[PDB]
Amino acid sequence: MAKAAAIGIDLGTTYSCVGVFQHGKVEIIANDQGNRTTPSYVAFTDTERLIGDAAKNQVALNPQNTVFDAKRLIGRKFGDPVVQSDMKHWPFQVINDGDKPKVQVSYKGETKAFYPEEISSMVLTKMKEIAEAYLGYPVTNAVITVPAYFNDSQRQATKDAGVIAGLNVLRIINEPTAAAIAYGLDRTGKGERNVLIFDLGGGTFDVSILTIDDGIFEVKATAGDTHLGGEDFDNRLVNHFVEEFKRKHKKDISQNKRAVRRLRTACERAKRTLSSSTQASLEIDSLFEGIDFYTSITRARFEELCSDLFRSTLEPVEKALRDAKLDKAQIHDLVLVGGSTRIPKVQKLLQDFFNGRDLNKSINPDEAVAYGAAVQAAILIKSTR
Numbered sequence: 361m362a363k364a365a366a367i368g369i370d371l372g373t374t375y376s377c378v379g380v381f382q383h384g385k386v387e388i389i390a391n392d393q394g395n396r397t398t399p400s401y402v403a404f405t406d407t408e409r410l411i412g413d414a415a416k417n418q419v420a421l422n423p424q425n426t427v428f429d430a431k432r433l434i435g436r437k438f439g440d441p442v443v444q445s446d447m448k449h450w451p452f453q454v455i456n457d458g459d460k461p462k463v464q465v466s467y468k469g470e471t472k473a474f475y476p477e478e479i480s481s482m483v484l485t486k487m488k489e490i491a492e493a494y495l496g497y498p499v500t501n502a503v504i505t506v507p508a509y510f511n512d513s514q515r516q517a518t519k520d521a522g523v524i525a526g527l528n529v530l531r532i533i534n535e536p537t538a539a540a541i542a543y544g545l546d547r548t549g550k551g552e553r554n555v556l557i558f559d560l561g562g563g564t565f566d567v568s569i570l571t572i573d574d575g576i577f578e579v580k581a582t583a584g585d586t587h588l589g590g591e592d593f594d595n596r597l598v599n600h601f602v603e604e605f606k607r608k609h610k611k612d613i614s615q616n617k618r619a620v621r622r623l624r625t626a627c628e629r630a631k632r633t634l635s636s637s638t639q640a641s642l643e644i645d646s647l648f649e650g651i652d653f654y655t656s657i658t659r660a661r662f663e664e665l666c667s668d669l670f671r672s673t674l675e676p677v678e679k680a681l682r683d684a685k686l687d688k689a690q691i692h693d694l695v696l697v698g699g700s701t702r703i704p705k706v707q708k709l710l711q712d713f714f715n716g717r718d719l720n721k722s723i724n725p726d727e728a729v730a731y732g733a734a735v736q737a738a739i740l741i742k743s744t745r
């Protein structure tokens with residue numbers, strides 16, 4: 361029943377996803393709001409603790425007590441230059457507890473501090489409760505994914521988050537390995553298969569090159585930009601609309617925090633529309649000083665606004681190819697991961713770089729990792745019996 365059941369969890373920087381393999385198919389489980397992906401946010405309020413969508417929805421009103429980016433802190437020392445640099449950009453407090461970072465917040469009127477693994481355990485608990493609500497029984501066996509460049513300390517702190525959340529962690533697998541499993545790239549029989557995983561998410565960009573030799577996975581190279589993702593494209597749209605508002609009304613909205621945030625959420629939505637339509641409309645009632653902002657943008661203008669950012673994704677691809685000591689024609693498969701890979705210009709740039717090659721993109725790219733983790737979790741739980 362429950363003991364013979366296992367889930368796959370993609371524990372992401374900005375979003376998390378849970379899948380289950382049953383009756384010969386993967387089901388990506390929707391949360392109580394009907395979304396197949398859940399924001400990796402935890403909010404601490406005057407009455408409750410919020411996780412996911414509810415936490416992300418109140419981030420504007422409560423920024424000091426809304427934690428996100430815990431994955432950037434997990435398994436790291438407070439003194440680590442990555443931690444010290446990132447701390448300057450978060451609205452929540454990060455403190456030092458014996459060279460280990462803790463997030464300090466106000467919760468139900470009291471000062472509380474949490475280890476990053478305790479924050480990630482709250483995200484994992486939510487994913488576990490989403491699976492339980494779908495299945496009708498508690499499921500405790502799980503496969504949890506991590507980036508391929510995570511070291512032993514980051515892998516151990518992820519497994520600890522899983523333990524705190526009440527999960528029996530069957531395995532910690534690499535995100536690009538879960539993605540190649542999703543496409544069945546480890547079931548092509550004999551001979552070494554070279555796979556490139558292009559993973560463009562909300563806040564990070566990762567390129568991974570894997571060799572799959574008779575079912576055995578080997579990471580040949582990892583490259584990328586830890587501070588490049590979908591949120592940089594939204595900000596490029598934001599800047600354009602702030603400048604358009606200034607030209608139409610002779611008014612600078614940039615200092616109005618509420619006006620900028622409503623513009624940001626509308627830009628994110630418009631950006632997603634631009635992946636399937638050649639234009640998108642913004643309909644913001646009373647944006648600033650009672651002025652409605654009803655405008656549109658083409659895909660061609662959006663592509664111009666992000667042109668340099670889209671082109672910058674090809675330098676880590678080249679870098680990963682040289683590190684792996686492989687030419688373009690030696691790559692058998694190209695896999696797309698992350699919601700941002702839905703952008704047509706991104707796909708065209710990657711396909712042109714690989715000389716007109718077909719891309720593996722039939723599985724929702726923001727769900728491919730959870731999909732593969734769910735397949736692995738089913739195989740692992742069957743072998744355990």
Ligand SMILES: Nc1ncnc2c1nc(Cl)n2[C@@H]1O[C@H](CO)[C@@H](O)[C@H]1O
Nearest residue numbers: 561562590591632635698699700702
């Ligand atoms: N249709 C889309 N067109 C463009 N960007 C998209 C799309 N869907 C998502 Cl999710 N994203 C972005 O992916 C990230 C999460 O993986 C977020 O930045 C989201 O906006």
